């Protein structure tokens, strides 16, 4: 029920959408799908930034690296999309589209890991407060 949880769920659903839809899709159709995955990521990353000030200092780094990795899954997905758009109406089409899928799949997996690191940081956070 937390904003981080919601943003991850959003980002994963955009990935599953694009995934189930990309086989029979022209660039016209799959650019927007990548555009949606992109902003859902940007949104999650903004939320995680607003969250770090509440998590223990000792967890900052693990979380920061998890965000870097998502940022380059995006970069990797965007690159595979550019290439699919270049080799449209050819037989490098399917190959590049399959590479987009892989890259989106990585992004979803890395989003969940980030959720898991933030969740564990929150648990460690409970073990820290002072009396009233
Ligand atoms: Zn959607
Ligand atoms: Zn009190």
Swiss-Prot record:
It is found in: Cell junction, Focal adhesion; Cell membrane; Cytoplasm, Perinuclear region; Cytoplasm, Cell cortex. It comes from the Eukaryota. The modification Phosphotyrosine is found at residue 5. Signal peptide: none annotated. Detected in B and T-lymphocytes. Isoform 1 and isoform 6 are detected in lung fibroblasts (at protein level). Ubiquitous. Expressed in epithelial cells (at protein level). Residues 1-132 are annotated as: Interaction with ARHGEF28. Changing residue 124 to E: In a metastatic melanoma sample; somatic mutation. Phosphorylated on tyrosine residues upon activation, e.g. upon integrin signaling. The Pro-rich regions interact with the SH3 domain of CAS family members, such as BCAR1 and NEDD9, and with the GTPase activating protein ARHGAP26. Interacts (via first Pro-rich region) with CAS family members (via SH3 domain), including BCAR1, BCAR3, and CASS4. Interacts with NEDD9 (via SH3 domain). Interacts with GIT1. Interacts with SORBS1. Interacts with ARHGEF28. Interacts with SHB. Part of a complex composed of THSD1, PTK2/FAK1, TLN1 and VCL. Interacts with PXN and TLN1. Interacts with STAT1. Interacts with DCC. Interacts with WASL. Interacts with ARHGEF7. Interacts with GRB2 and GRB7. Component of a complex that contains at least FER, CTTN and PTK2/FAK1. Interacts with BMX. Interacts with TGFB1I1. Interacts with STEAP4. It is linked to Aberrant PTK2/FAK1 expression may play a role in cancer cell proliferation, migration and invasion, in tumor formation and metastasis. PTK2/FAK1 overexpression is seen in many types of cancer. Non-receptor protein-tyrosine kinase that plays an essential role in regulating cell migration, adhesion, spreading, reorganization of the actin cytoskeleton, formation and disassembly of focal adhesions and cell protrusions, cell cycle progression, cell proliferation and apoptosis. Required for early embryonic development and placenta development. Required for embryonic angiogenesis, normal cardiomyocyte migration and proliferation, and normal heart development. Belongs to the protein kinase superfamily. Tyr protein kinase family. FAK subfamily. This is Focal adhesion kinase 1. The chain holds residues 921 to 1052 of 1052 of the full protein.
């Amino acid at each position: 029920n937390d904003k981080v949880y919601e943003n991850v769920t959003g980002l994963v659903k955009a990935v599953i959408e694009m995934s189930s839809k990309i086989q029979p899709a022209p660039p016209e159709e799959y650019v927007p799908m990548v555009k949606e995955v992109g902003l859902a990521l940007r949104t999650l990353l903004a939320t995680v930034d607003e969250t770090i000030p509440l998590l223990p200092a000792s967890t900052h780094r693990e979380i920061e690296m998890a965000q870097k990795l998502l940022n380059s899954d995006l970069g990797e997905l965007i690159n595979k999309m550019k290439l699919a758009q270049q080799y449209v109406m050819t037989s490098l089409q399917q190959e590049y589209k399959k590479q987009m899928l892989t890259a989106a799949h990585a992004l979803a997996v890395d989003a969940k890991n980030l959720l898991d690191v933030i969740d564990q940081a929150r648990l460690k956070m409970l073990g820290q407060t002072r009396p009233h």
